[PDB]
């Protein structure tokens, strides 16, 4: 099987939590299996970024509902030619 192999022969993007979840399912039994539901949500989360997108949705929603200024070290976008300039 090729499960766990990335596009470059390494470990794919979501390997670590998958392997943690398998460590669960190895240690537990069918009755006890619900015991690491948490590892499985972590796996599905790495896969699909759903709660992350929800959190970003609430952050954006509250950001666009704000007229007061933001004082924090900001993020700057540069042209690819300008990497390392100045």
């Amino acid at each position: 099987t090729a499960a766990g192999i990335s596009l470059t022969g390494g470990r794919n993007r979501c390997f670590s939590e998958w392997q943690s979840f398998m460590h669960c399912t190895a240690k537990t039994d069918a009755k006890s299996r619900a015991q690491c539901l948490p590892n499985f949500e972590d796996y599905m989360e790495c896969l699909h970024h759903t709660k992350e997108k929800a959190r970003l949705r609430e952050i954006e929603s509250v950001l666009k509902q704000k007229k007061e200024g933001l004082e924090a070290p900001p993020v700057k976008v540069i042209p690819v030619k300008a990497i390392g300039l100045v």
Partner: protein, 69 residues
């Protein structure tokens, strides 16, 4: 003089033996039904040799820290 039936006690004993065999079959039947619904080990149900469920992924770009238990 020509009537030679088996004794009443012998009839009862023989029927009791038959019923005992029948109850043994009922118990074996219920037993097998329960045992089929119990869950087997990973080695017995999936793989005897290589009995570790935990995968190891690809080995080219093996990154320190990617292993998680």
């Amino acid at each position: 003089t020509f009537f030679h039936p088996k004794s009443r006690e012998d009839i009862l004993n023989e029927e009791a033996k038959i019923v005992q065999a029948l109850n043994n079959q009922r118990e074996l039947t219920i037993k097998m039904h329960e045992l089929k619904r119990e869950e087997k080990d990973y080695a017995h149900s999936y793989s005897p040799l290589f009995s570790d469920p935990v995968p190891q992924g690809g080995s080219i770009g093996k990154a320190p820290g990617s292993s998680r238990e």
